[PDB]
């Protein structure tokens, strides 16, 4: 009965180890800084305890730089480390399933057939290899998860139009880690481009200090990472050190008078000095969350992060059908095209000129670098594309088969020789 709690926690510990062994085996910082682990298919608890060892040294090092402190800022360190935190995802995909939230990593999502469209690049999977984590943005206000997120933006990106707020008391958060900046862009935005200009604007001449001050300027990118235990002390203990090396009236005005009002006078302090980030392991699923529609979704991102129920609600006439089809022609959205080909009835006269915002003709777009073969097959064997017509605007004088053989696409060259002549 209650003995199922041990297995329920032991396996949740087991699943989290592998997403940490990946980052501590791959990646280059941990190789260069001595924080690397030998590569192996089956990890153990060596990967998990290494985070504990590395987070303490990150906390100890910043602790030693400061003295014994004083009673003035006890209303700061104790105020922060005894508050309530709520993380926020802000993604454009469908993550509801009625009354759950199956938010998945990049490695899990790409392990099988996916509905991807996130914001990972090469190097992130090479320099760090933290693609097996679910990222979150922190809120320090401590209000209810059902009221609103007042910070609609991370460092600079607006990752989506649907925030998924979760309490930090969830059992799945116990194995994440915190970083005071983006783990790959170790640079706080400062003053001019930081959000909430009504706050930073009223307080000048510290925005230069918050401007671009990187963290752990030892290897210029060796970002500090903290455990779940140490994630609350570090955001406040680092805040004091930044204050100590600062000179202003906001030093004493709204850092030691906001302790009574830990709402918009504390969220905006910590969200401007730092840029927090939480990394939950492979998957985060819970029935305790909130979905806040921040802004109405456009049609472009309903195609990129494939969301068919929202996309079907967006299109109203055939005019938006071809525009959504032109979006699917790029990015290689196989699933979007199949959905659109079942509802509307297109014609070769539709795809005769690139609509505004598109820089390539129909024949070039189909044979681009990352284009999809499924849409090419459904265009050639439907009387919509001329297989042997040559390009007339960009790289002129060539045909589709030239693109396939330049970029080395054997699966597209075979498709072209079959469905056409070339």
């Amino acid at each position: 009965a209650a003995a199922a709690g041990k297995i329920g926690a032991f396996l949740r510990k087991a699943v989290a180890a592998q997403s940490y062994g990946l980052m501590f085996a791959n990646g280059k910082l941990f190789e260069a800084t001595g924080d690397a682990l030998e590569k192996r298919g089956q990890y153990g608890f060596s990967a998990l305890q290494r985070l504990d060892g590395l987070s303490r040294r990150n906390l100890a090092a910043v602790e030693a730089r400061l003295g014994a402190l004083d009673s003035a800022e006890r209303g700061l360190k104790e105020r922060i480390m005894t508050g309530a935190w709520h993380f926020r995802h802000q993604s454009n995909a469908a993550l509801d399933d009625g009354k759950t939230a199956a938010i998945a990593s990049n490695h899990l999502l790409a392990r099988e057939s996916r509905s991807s469209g996130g914001n990972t690049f090469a190097g992130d999977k090479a320099l760090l290899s933290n693609h097996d984590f679910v990222f979150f943005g922190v809120e320090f206000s401590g209000r209810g998860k059902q009221d609103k997120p007042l910070n609609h933006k991370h460092s600079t990106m607006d990752f989506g139009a649907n925030a998924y707020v979760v309490p930090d008391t969830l059992p799945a958060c116990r194995h994440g880690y915190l970083t005071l900046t983006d783990h790959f862009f170790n640079r706080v935005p400062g003053g001019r481009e930081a959000e909430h200009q009504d706050f930073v604007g009223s307080f000048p001449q510290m925005g230069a200090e918050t401007g671009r001050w990187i963290h752990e300027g030892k290897y210029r990118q060796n970002a500090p990472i903290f455990n779940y235990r140490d994630m609350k002390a570090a955001v406040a203990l680092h805040l004091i050190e930044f204050l100590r090396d600062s000179k202003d009236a906001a030093f004493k005005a709204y850092v030691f008078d906001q302790a009574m009002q830990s709402g918009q006078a504390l969220d905006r302090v910590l969200n401007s000095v730092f840029q927090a980030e939480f990394h939950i392991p492979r998957l985060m699923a819970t029935t305790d969350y909130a979905k806040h529609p921040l802004r109405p979704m456009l049609l472009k991102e309903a195609v990129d992060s494939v969301n068919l129920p929202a996309l079907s609600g967006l299109v109203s006439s055939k005019g938006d059908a071809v525009t959504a089809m032109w979006h699917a022609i790029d990015k290689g959205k196989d699933a979007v095209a199949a959905h659109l080909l079942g509802n509307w009835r297109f014609e070769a006269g539709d795809f005769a000129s690139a609509p505004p915002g598109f820089y390539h003709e129909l024949n070039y777009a189909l044979s681009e670098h990352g284009a999809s073969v499924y849409i090419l097959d459904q265009f050639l064997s439907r009387g919509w594309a001329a297989v042997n017509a040559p390009f007339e605007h960009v790289n002129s004088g060539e045909t589709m088969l030239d693109n396939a053989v330049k970029y080395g696409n054997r699966e597209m060259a075979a498709a072209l020789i079959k469905h056409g002549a070339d």
Binding site: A122, S155, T156, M157, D158, R187, Y359, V394, N395
Partner: protein, 210 residues
């Protein structure tokens, strides 16, 4: 004096755009670049030029087509423009296969070897990411060292190209040419830098697009 660009049409505009690179050489994807060629094609074709866009050329294709555009004809043409957008680091443009030195491109356009183009401008806009060949009436404009540290909100275009296209659509009808390139230097320096383009000019007269 001036170049007397009253010929029946102005010369060509050739745009070379390299974004996807061979993984053997180890180059970044360099996204957000096809908008630049869109701006450049519309801007230069606006005046009188015959734009020829050429995406993702090779180490040999860049050299070969220049040897083809050099020796075709220019007796009825007034100027000549070339634009290079690539991922070169040194003063050499990197092809998708291998690095190519700037000298080889311009050897075909010297007055010795391109007598159809003599006494006429030969512009060269280079946007890398300076072994200049000395010859009269040439003009090179490098713009190296990007890296303003855009976050995951990736840069839409590039500072130099958008500034060049912006200042040239209105001012390039009464304001000279070197009076425009200095403004491009200023706009990048002031509004963008919270490294800078160089204007290696060897023109013997002035240049007016009207």
């Amino acid at each position: 004096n001036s170049y007397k660009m009253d010929y029946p049409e102005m010369g060509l505009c050739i745009i070379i755009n390299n974004k996807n690179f061979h993984k053997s050489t180890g180059m970044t994807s360099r996204s957000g670049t096809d908008v630049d060629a869109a701006n450049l094609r519309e801007t230069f074709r606006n005046l009188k030029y015959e734009v020829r866009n050429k995406n993702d050329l090779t180490r040999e294709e860049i050299v070969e087509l220049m040897r083809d555009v050099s020796k075709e004809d220019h007796s009825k043409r007034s100027s000549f423009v070339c634009v290079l957008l690539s991922h070169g680091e040194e003063g050499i443009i990197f092809g998708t296969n291998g690095p190519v030195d700037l000298k080889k491109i311009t050897n075909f356009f010297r007055g010795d070897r391109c007598r159809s183009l003599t006494g006429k401008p030969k512009l060269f806009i280079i946007q890398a990411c300076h072994k200049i060949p000395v010859e009269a009436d040439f003009l090179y404009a490098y713009s190296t060292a990007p890296g303003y540290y855009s976050w995951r909100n990736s840069k839409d275009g590039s500072w130099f190209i958008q500034s060049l296209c912006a200042m040239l659509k209105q001012y390039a009808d009464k304001l000279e040419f070197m009076h425009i390139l200095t403004r491009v230097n200023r706009k990048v320096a002031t509004e963008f830098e919270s490294q800078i383009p160089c204007i290696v000019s060897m023109l013997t007269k002035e240049l007016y697009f009207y």
